[PDB]
Symmetry: none
Subunit: 156 residues, 2 copies
């Protein structure tokens, strides 16, 4: 179960995942390397996230390096999974090892729609400074994410 | 409109006259609903005649329910049985992954549950999105007679 459930999620095989969920499984079980199905899930599959969360998957878990799935979703620009994570109470203000929130990571990578959603429809602390004293907008400015900067200062 | 309203208000005679003239059994009214969907439950003959004449039994409404879900949920054995005699999928899932068995069990519709566990292809072990079997739902809602019936039939 735990291993196979993680495997199906990592591969993005919804059919196999749903087949596996018919069993009495602990969706928060850790695979061979200490990550759960939700943590290893191939992004771009919001339904897999939904099915894992509907079964009780903890979204706030962190990996080797203090990253929660929402950090990964924000950094890579996967709005759908970020939103489903949030509809299931995931913490928007979860910080990585350096004090960065999902907003810092989306801002840094120039994911305008993700930043817009976080700034406008979430509890994201827009003024949160990471450990080096940088806010998400500071990182957007540093990485040349002009549209993100403009958007951030237009509403926050 | 003629066929749909006839089904909706239980006018078996008008419905049958309409059917004799090869009326389009699967026409969708202004709200996108067929005669079988608007059909008032407790009128198995209307269901039977529509089906006999070509009504799609597996159609889902906008809330994600097939007519068999409605009949099981409300305790209308007769209509559920006829739906099945015309190939309706007993294992059709609503938006939450519930089978008609889950809905009948949760509502304590003993005779409906009895028929599904004894004379149909219902997957008695099917889990919905929260991971619950029909028997799990029955105990969750305190339907002990339903729990007893299921356990007495190998469906616990």
């Amino acid at each position: 179960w735990g291993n196979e459930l993680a495997s199906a999620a990592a591969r993005g095989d919804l059919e196999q995942l749903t087949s596996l969920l018919q069993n009495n499984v602990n969706v928060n079980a850790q695979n061979g390397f200490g990550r759960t199905a939700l943590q290893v899930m191939k992004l771009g599959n919001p339904e897999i996230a939904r099915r894992l969360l509907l079964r009780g998957a903890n979204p706030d878990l962190k990996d080797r390096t203090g990253f929660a799935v929402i950090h990964d979703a924000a950094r890579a620009g996967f709005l759908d999974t970020l939103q489903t994570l949030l509809e299931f109470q995931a913490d928007v203000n979860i910080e990585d090892n350096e004090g960065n929130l999902p907003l810092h990571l989306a801002a840094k990578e120039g994911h305008l729609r993700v930043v817009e959603f976080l700034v406008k429809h979430t509890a994201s602390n827009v003024g949160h400074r990471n450990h080096k004293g940088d806010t998400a907008c500071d990182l957007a400015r540093l990485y040349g994410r002009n549209e993100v900067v403009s958007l951030m200062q237009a509403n926050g």
